[PDB]
Design a protein around this nucleic acid. Structure first.
Lengths: 29, 81, 53, 93, 82, 100, 79
DNA sequence: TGCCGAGGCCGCTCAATTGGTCGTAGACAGCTCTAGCACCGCTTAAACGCACGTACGCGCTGTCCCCCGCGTTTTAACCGCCAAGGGGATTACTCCCTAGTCTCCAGGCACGTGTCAGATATATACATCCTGTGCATGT
DNA sequence: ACATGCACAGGATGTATATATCTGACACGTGCCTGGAGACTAGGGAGTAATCCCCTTGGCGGTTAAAACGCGGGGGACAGCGCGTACGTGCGTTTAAGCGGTGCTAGAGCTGTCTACGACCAATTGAGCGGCCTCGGCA
């Protein structure tokens, strides 16, 4: 039953850092 | 720094490095009044010509570097003599 | 409503411009007390006690 | 504190959009209706006409409550004020 | 499913409606009573719309059945027609 | 009888218990019965009144004033006064949609 | 003079039927203003009905119709 | 009776909000119906609207007499106005979700045609009903 | 002893039978658009912790309306005039009604844009430094 909650956890765990780091790489130039 | 004080306090910085530090010379400033009190282990002043003003402005840079023995302006006026 | 659109820098009437007209004019306002202009919002108003100082 | 609340008032009085989320309100309509009759259907526009009337009723309630609160000089609002607004406009007692 | 979906009225929406009504500070006592007051309004509008729908023998409520409820409640609405 | 001169602001309650109970109209007939004509004649001169019409006006108007005063009582109590004061009427008359 | 025919003790009597404990000294004349504009708003509609009806005695029906239109209705005058 | 301190003035520094320009796509006017069903025609269809006339009865204008409006001084409760407290609403953060767009299924229901039966308006005679009226009567 | 309540006469009122048909309840075709759920997406919101500042609180204090009270004017109560209202009445003008004619205004279409809807950049107005200067000041 927990797997449908876990797949939501892992995709948001990457999306969190991904958008922040993607904005960092666009910002610093 | 004067606007984001609590957000820069949110980290244990090892060094507060401070460029062109003649900007700290006024002990009256909200800058210097804050900048004495950030928690870091060590500091640097990188002055393009330090001091070169009245005694209170020597005191202001000195007390930011080290808090020791700088207890008053009149003892600092004692300390060619 | 067309004056409200002009003053809002527009020329297509939308429910907002009608609401602005109807609530600026006291005669339309008192004719139209029992009615809502759908998606027109409300007339912008700050109380004197809420304004600065 | 309290300066940005005035900027929120200006922003939401300049804008004209729905302040409640559509899907939660769409459920609320159906979830109430299901004991006035079994299994109501709703046309897509009907939930919006309901939501518009409800938000307009709530904005009018807060407007009348603002006059209640500022009459009592308090800038903050409580049920103490809304229970004048309903009782004096006429929906209760 | 069925539930008390009045807790679908998220607290920022109540704050925004209040801020559109120009009230500046909103005590913790307001929110759950205001949910009740909103629900009480919906109940009458829905009761009436359901009865305009019962004459038509419908299950399907239209924007007209609510506009007619709003007419009998004296809180009329322009834009949906009627 | 027995409380007699008890606490100023309480023969007020002795008055409530008279006027709330009774059927009387609390404005004198004749002054009002002239005033309704003065109010009418600005829009059309030389009007008469049915002797029932002036009473229908008085009874609706005294009921309107009584209802306004009782709503104004809530306006005072909400502001933590037992004295009604002008701003109480202003609140009531705005919220009932009569002044805005 | 006619508007002062709403007597100072009549304001107190009406407010005492209205349940209020105490009256501020400024209430009276502005409350005559409220009674005046209410009377005026119903009387003008009643005259508006009476003029369509050709008559020029203001009837109990003319004022019942004004009060019915304005949602301030009364019963007992033959509605 | 020699020498400085604290504070005001005039000006830069840099960070918040605001008004204007560029473009792409939602939904406008502009067709262009086709299309059919609204809006206008002439007369005859009746009655309801309309004007004089005046019986008939309620509304103004003076009654005459006891009560209410008006005004003051008084008094204890209240409201004007305040300082100060500490409860609590605003505050930013990092946490999570479910609101919204969309793509598609697939089903239940709303709708329109064709039908016919049984319902009501109209029109008359049927037959019994409610009212204005005189003046009785009950609390 | 007054407002409400009693039975008779009058005259029309509600009624029962009738001719003629269109309103509307029904089965079926219709076929939309709503109900549904999932994938995908990230903007919005949930909950906690910080702490400023607001509404409540107890209070000082004044001054206000209620309270008690009397003077004199005017509200409340009948006769007398006359002017309006409700009909009586026939006239005649008003719209209703038959159902064609045919105009434009309708649903729904398709059209090409093209205002104004997002999203980005360059304005004007805000509190904190910096050095000058004088006034106020001490020894």
């Amino acid at each position: 039953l927990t797997e449908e909650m876990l797949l939501k956890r892992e995709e948001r765990a990457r999306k969190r850092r991904l958008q922040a780091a993607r904005r960092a790489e666009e910002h610093k130039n | 720094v004067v606007q984001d004080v609590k957000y820069f306090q949110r980290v244990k910085w090892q060094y507060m490095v401070l460029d062109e530090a003649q900007a700290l010379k006024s002990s009256s400033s909200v800058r210097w009044k804050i900048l004495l009190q950030f928690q870091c282990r060590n500091r640097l002043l990188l002055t393009g010509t330090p001091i070169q003003n009245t005694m209170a402005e020597l005191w202001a840079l000195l007390h930011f570097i080290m808090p020791t023995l700088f207890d008053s302006h009149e003892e600092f006026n004692e300390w060619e003599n | 409503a067309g004056n409200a659109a002009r003053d809002n820098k527009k020329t297509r009437i939308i429910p907002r411009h009608l609401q602005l007209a109807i609530r600026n004019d006291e005669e339309l306002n008192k004719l139209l007390g029992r009615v809502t202009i759908a998606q027109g919002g409300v007339l912008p108003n700050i109380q004197a006690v809420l304004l600065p100082k | 504190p309290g300066t940005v609340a005035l900027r929120e008032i200006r922003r939401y009085q300049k804008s004209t959009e729905l302040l409640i989320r559509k899907l939660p309100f769409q459920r609320l309509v159906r979830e109430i209706a299901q004991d006035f009759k079994t299994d109501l259907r709703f046309q897509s526009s009907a939930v919006m006409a309901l939501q518009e009337a409800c938000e307009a009723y709530l904005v009018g309630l807060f407007e009348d409550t603002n006059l209640c609160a500022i009459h009592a000089k308090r800038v903050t609002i409580m049920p103490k004020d809304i229970q004048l607004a309903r009782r004096i406009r006429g929906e209760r007692a | 499913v069925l539930r008390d979906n009045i807790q679908g009225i998220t607290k920022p929406a109540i704050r925004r409606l209040a801020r559109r009504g120009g009230v500046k500070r909103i005590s913790g006592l307001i929110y759950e009573e205001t949910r009740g007051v909103l629900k009480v309004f919906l109940e009458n509008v829905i009761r009436d719309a359901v009865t305009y729908t019962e004459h038509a023998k419908r299950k399907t409520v239209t924007a007209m059945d609510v506009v007619y409820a709003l007419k009998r409640q004296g809180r009329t609405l322009y834009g949906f027609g009627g």
